[PDB]
Design an enzyme around this catalytic site. Structure first.
Site, PDB file in Angstrom:
ATOM      1  N   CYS A 155       0.755  -1.243   0.000  1.00  0.00           N
ATOM      2  CA  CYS A 155       0.000   0.000   0.000  1.00  0.00           C
ATOM      3  C   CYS A 155       0.793   1.307   0.000  1.00  0.00           C
ATOM      4  O   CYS A 155       0.231   2.360  -0.320  1.00  0.00           O
ATOM      5  CB  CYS A 155      -1.009  -0.017   1.165  1.00  0.00           C
ATOM      6  N   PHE A 206     -11.096  -2.803  -1.701  1.00  0.00           N
ATOM      7  CA  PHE A 206     -10.164  -2.671  -2.821  1.00  0.00           C
ATOM      8  C   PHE A 206     -10.803  -2.467  -4.179  1.00  0.00           C
ATOM      9  O   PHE A 206     -11.927  -2.897  -4.426  1.00  0.00           O
ATOM     10  CB  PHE A 206      -9.258  -3.900  -2.904  1.00  0.00           C
TER      11      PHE A 206
END
Lengths: 366, 369
Positions: A155, A206
């Site tokens: 991330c 996501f």
């Protein structure tokens, strides 16, 4: 040789996403349908409550109902399928990344061939030659373009990627760096399991996308410098490597999403920034932050006592595209200048496994 | 803009390491067919026997032992999922082996791990976040704010790619000290023999384990001993050659392809490559010194014939292939270290490595006193 004179600056930003768009309202039914589990009414129920509190209005997915039917192995939670997953990614990523890249090049104003360095990052891959290589023919980059390929950085990849660009651009006169981050969630996709909350968080948080940025110092008159990268740092939150983990597995791209995550960023963020930039409140700065989720964004707001509008852009991106791993933050910076159309200094930051905080003190220009 | 370094980034130290289990080439054939239950394939063993005898490697170091193989019957079953067990072993062994190498490098350098500002790590044997780079933090006593770069799966040109990155990190920041680490554990490829494809035997008689670390920094203290200044780092691609060489993770192991065209593609193109890469900055290549990734003995021949190099030029490189085998991205660094020892004249030299692409990643170096 010779070097650049001023600060590396962001000259253009380009993003892109899969054409298939699934709204948050329709994610539960879709998900429980293609995973053959509409009978698990309760689990599908816990997934409805969850989704409504994630902060996402819709996502874009490369994977479709036809693609999943073509690969029942992705759904068989306990069956090998990385290969099938990597073969689809081996083509889809370069495609998606090129699109976002062309968009950045279009705003920039110079031909792909004027690019001297290429820095690519994505969890959706594992090949040599990698995406960085396949982007050369897809974009028309010169054969001698200097490439860096970052497979699986999580991330905080976008920020990490932008940190190398700064030094790449500043240490060579005329150097121009294309940075590209792209994510495909079909790498994590699998059927749900009565006790595995992470699968639902992922499935409802996501999204797919690719973000592109052109970085260069000593910008021409034709180029329009948007942001200057004053400093680029990174640090670690103590004893928290067990809260976030990612790794390739026979079954898919697996990992751990600990409940402590939000609280850890919340309790450490301010400290992290001061150690990274120490040398007049946080509201005097502008913000482009990887939106983990609305909770995460609420943790950052609280810890820094930021007015609502500060992470507005970031929440907007999470809301319109969902969490797209490393590219998310770049989408954020993009959304920040679209709406900008006041503070001169700002922070571009992202968290990821470690826990790792990667950030840049930015300077807005005309 | 903040302060940058004055001079070129320089190699202030080099450290290497290898798993303790050493296996000679003469031993490879029996070891391999034994642990792969293919000792009845007398014909194939003979094939692998002569292939092994002309690789240019006399011995190698392997983290995987026979006890470890017996414990992982799944590894030699070409048709069995096992990337999980391979990665689990690597998640522990690579950072441990990488620490050994970085430590030797830090020991040579003379300064504290705390003076390290950036960390760049490359390896095909890993696929985790936090990766090998994060793990080196506690193991080396590096500062939390150290700036890391984790390069997963970059192939045989990773060593140079990593160093190319370090040049700018070091030069762009006054006082920067970069720790570059490349590591390779061939258990990631380990599998049983095959009739259809001999890529396995090729890899089995050529690749070995190893890790190498380098401290890179500009403007040396009087207490430091710069060894080689990185004048220029570039990279290029050879046309229509991506098919002859490639790698990728698969559920069964780390697989890919080694084409016969590889050696010829390097001999036919290296000179064009160097020229396009360093053209202006640089009456023959026999005047430079050389540290070159040694794919194999045949590849060394190709470079020798294409650049017109006398046998001594690539000796340090062939020496490494001979004592360690092909250790992927780490190999070209062992070679530079070997060159350094085989010199205890040309002031300019070339550190070069090839990999999937096909890719040529190299730097023009300047040998100091």
């Amino acid at each position: 040789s010779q070097r650049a004179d001023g600060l590396a600056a962001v000259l253009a930003i380009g993003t892109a996403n899969p054409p298939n768009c699934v709204t948050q309202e329709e994610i539960p039914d879709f998900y429980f349908r293609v995973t053959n589990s509409d009978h698990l009414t309760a689990l599908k129920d816990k997934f409805k409550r969850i989704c409504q509190e994630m902060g996402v209005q819709r996502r874009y997915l490369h994977h479709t109902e036809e693609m999943l039917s073509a690969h029942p192995e992705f759904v068989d939670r306990d069956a090998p399928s990385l290969d099938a997953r990597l073969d689809i990614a081996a083509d889809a990523v370069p495609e998606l990344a090129a699109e976002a890249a062309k968009k950045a090049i279009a705003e920039w104003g110079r031909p792909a061939a004027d690019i001297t360095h290429l820095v690519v990052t994505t969890n959706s891959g594992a090949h040599v030659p990698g995406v960085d290589f396949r982007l050369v023919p897809l974009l028309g980059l010169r054969p001698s373009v200097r490439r860096t390929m970052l497979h699986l950085n999580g991330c905080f990849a976008g920020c990490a990627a932008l940190r190398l660009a700064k030094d790449l651009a500043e240490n060579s006169r005329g150097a121009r760096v294309l940075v590209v981050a792209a994510e495909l969630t079909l790498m994590y996709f699998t059927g749900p399991d009565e006790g595995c909350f992470r699968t639902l968080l992922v499935q409802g948080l996501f999204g797919d996308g690719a973000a592109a940025v052109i970085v260069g110092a000593d910008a021409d008159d034709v180029e329009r410098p948007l942001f200057e990268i004053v400093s680029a740092a990174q640090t670690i939150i103590p004893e928290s490597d067990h809260a976030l983990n990612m790794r390739f597995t026979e079954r898919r791209l697996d990992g751990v999403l600990g409940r402590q995550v939000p609280g850890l960023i919340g309790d450490n963020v301010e400290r992290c920034l001061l150690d990274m930039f120490g040398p007049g409140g946080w509201n005097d700065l502008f913000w482009a932050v990887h939106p983990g989720s609305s909770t995460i964004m609420d943790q950052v707001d609280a810890a820094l006592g930021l007015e609502p509008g500060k992470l507005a852009a970031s929440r907007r991106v999470l809301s319109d595209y969902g969490n797209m791993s490393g590219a998310t933050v770049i989408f954020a910076l993009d959304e920040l200048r679209r709406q900008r159309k006041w503070p001169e200094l700002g922070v571009m930051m992202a968290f990821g496994p470690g826990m790792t905080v990667d950030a840049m003190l930015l300077h807005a220009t005309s």
